[PDB]
Symmetry: C4
Subunit: 201 residues, 4 copies
């Protein structure tokens, strides 16, 4: 009701904004498609909503909502549930469209991404062309080294992702420094298979 | 009027959110029950409201609202009224349900809690099983030592609590360092009766 | 229209809040009176409003609104108009009721106050009983020394004041350190006539 | 619809605010004119709007909206598109009226300005009287030296500008320190032709 009415009303304002700025018809369609995928006809102020509840219910809700994400990703599946919960409560849902460059090589990285659904392509000068899909994550290397991105990552399909900011990543690893090692091992494995070696891990 | 209408409208959005995420019927009931207890059919933007007033009226209102809390808790009852007021204006009302773990042992603590109404259980590896009830507080030990929580605390009944963040606790003790001692003495007493000794107090 | 309707609607929510907390009839009247004095039947989101404009119009508006304040107070009347403007744009309007203690001796001070209209009483252990009225200011001593308040200040009548936070005071004196001296001289004069001497000025 | 209704409604609140403060008729007209120029009958919460989208669409939208600004200004036209995008996403649209002093000499500078449309006059004690117009920028010297403004800049016509804060300027030059040199060269050229020499560039 108010959730479906909010979607319509908010989308209307998007239409008037695009009209005001005279965006072309293809660009408008693209934005429309993204809106459909990202919100699916409803809008919630999830912040305000979760902010009315308490810690325990928020945590119970986030665990319920991400059951498949958690169970399909060994890093989350085998870890301390308190660590899992601390990660989940800071994740932000994002949708990307095919061809979008989620991450650009060389740039400075402020987030990593957990793939709920979709396929992306890790691209590099080298020619290394590796896919990643449901149950994996990426963008973690630059958060561990605080270097620049080691590759570009491009959306092949529509991608439903959950992002985690560099600040929250670090706040979580402060409390659970055990799990930093689990990220570094895979990060090393991955760099290894694109002729890279970082002494920082 | 607008306060009762706000509750209904806000709860409706909660229902649509739960529906959207397909939460089970028991979880929905649990969230409904919490809402009833936490808001009791009305919603106020207490922030905005208090922000329209001045310092003196805010302080007069918070003292009126917490008269029983203040008078039933010797730490507040016997102290400097300016200290009391400074604590009260920073307290945040929270409701917990039976079985909820308000605090987990070993974790890092960012708040303590004053019990307006309810019973909680301080749980520890040891086997020490102590209850606390109306007029007491907990969660203070980790704010004084900045260690990890010394025990878990679990709600036995519905609990009406007022929380105080670690930042506000410290801002208040900066202005009134006299009262830090009053927290440390009880903290020592409590650690003593669970075979703990911290040299930090 | 929407400004008068906002006042009514906002006051209604205040009434429901007071009712919810069961405040006594005298306290309710007091809050009602304050509301009348503070808002005079209208409410504006002056922030949002001024935020739609630019720097030059904001500055022109604040100067227009405070013409009598500026012209009646020699510190503002004789100074650099850019300094005046920088002070004015950071001032916050506040109303106090008779008997209110605006400032308490011994406490830590985070603001000073410019009197638009009203009489206050500077009170001290000593017995020094000095009035201040339209065109003067107070609360500046603790901002210059960062000590504790040197006296208590109490509202004799309804007081229309403009407050300035310690952060903004300092940001303004950074840009115009010339004017710090003008505050210190009066501050010294005032301390002198209550048997105080601070070497910090 | 809601965008045109928002403009009207917001302007109405401006009228009631001006009425409340008893602004004169000329000042009211001036504010009305600014509103027309600045919003052109529509209001969007561009923040909220762009915040519903993702990084790639925001970036695509900002590039589309500023095509003429980017293509007419060699600094942007010939640079790395990622640098351009990083600048554009932080720019804030502002409108100034004829006679307005956008920048005052001697003051401390917290922003620079890119001229979308309009003519301004760089004024100095000296007597140097230089115009700048569509496709140029100003206010950059104080951001590079962190001194005081080297001149005053005054609007000759209505000016459509995009401002960039000192914090964002620096965050962008951190990532692309190559382009600081491009600002310094012009800054030196400009100081040279008003008998100034700063060793800081
Ligand atoms: N699967 C795979 N293989 C080799 C790789 N080299 C880099 N990456 C991912 O691309 C990412 C590019 O961003 P980042 O360097 O922050 O983290 C990098 C890794 O997640 C790789 N991913
Ligand atoms: N009553 C009681 N007795 C022994 C205790 N040992 C610890 N606590 C409380 O449990 C709390 C667990 O969180 P914390 O360690 O921050 O503060 C601790 C105390 O408030 C105790 N409370
Ligand atoms: N008029 C007057 N005379 C002696 C005073 N001694 C202190 N004050 C004011 O009371 C104020 C109490 O707060 P503060 O010490 O921050 O600044 C102090 C002065 O403005 C005095 N005001
Ligand atoms: N065109 C031109 N010529 C000489 C100049 N000397 C200073 N400026 C501009 O005026 C500006 C005044 O603000 P700022 O000193 O921060 O940057 C300065 C320059 O953009 C000048 N602009």
């Amino acid at each position: 009701d108010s959730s479906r009415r909010q979607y319509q009303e908010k989308y209307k304002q998007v239409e008037q904004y695009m009209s005001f700025h005279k965006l072309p018809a293809d660009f408008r369609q693209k934005i429309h498609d993204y809106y459909e995928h990202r919100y699916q006809g409803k809008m919630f102020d999830e912040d305000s909503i979760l902010g009315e509840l308490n810690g325990p219910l928020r945590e119970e809700i986030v665990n319920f909502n991400c059951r498949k994400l958690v169970a399909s990703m060994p890093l989350f599946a085998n870890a301390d549930p308190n660590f899992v919960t601390a990660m989940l409560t800071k994740l932000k849902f994002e949708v990307f469209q095919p061809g979008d460059y989620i991450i650009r090589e060389g740039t400075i990285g402020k987030k990593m991404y957990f793939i709920q659904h979709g396929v992306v392509s890790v691209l590099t000068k080298g020619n290394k062309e590796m896919k990643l899909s449901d149950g994996s994550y990426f963008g973690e290397i630059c958060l561990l080294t605080r270097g620049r991105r080691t590759a570009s990552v491009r959306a092949d399909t529509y991608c439903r992702l959950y992002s985690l900011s560099v600040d929250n990543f670090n706040e979580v690893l402060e409390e659970y420094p055990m799990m930093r090692r689990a990220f570094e091992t895979v990060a090393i494995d991955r760099l290894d298979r694109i002729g890279k070696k970082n002494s920082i891990l």
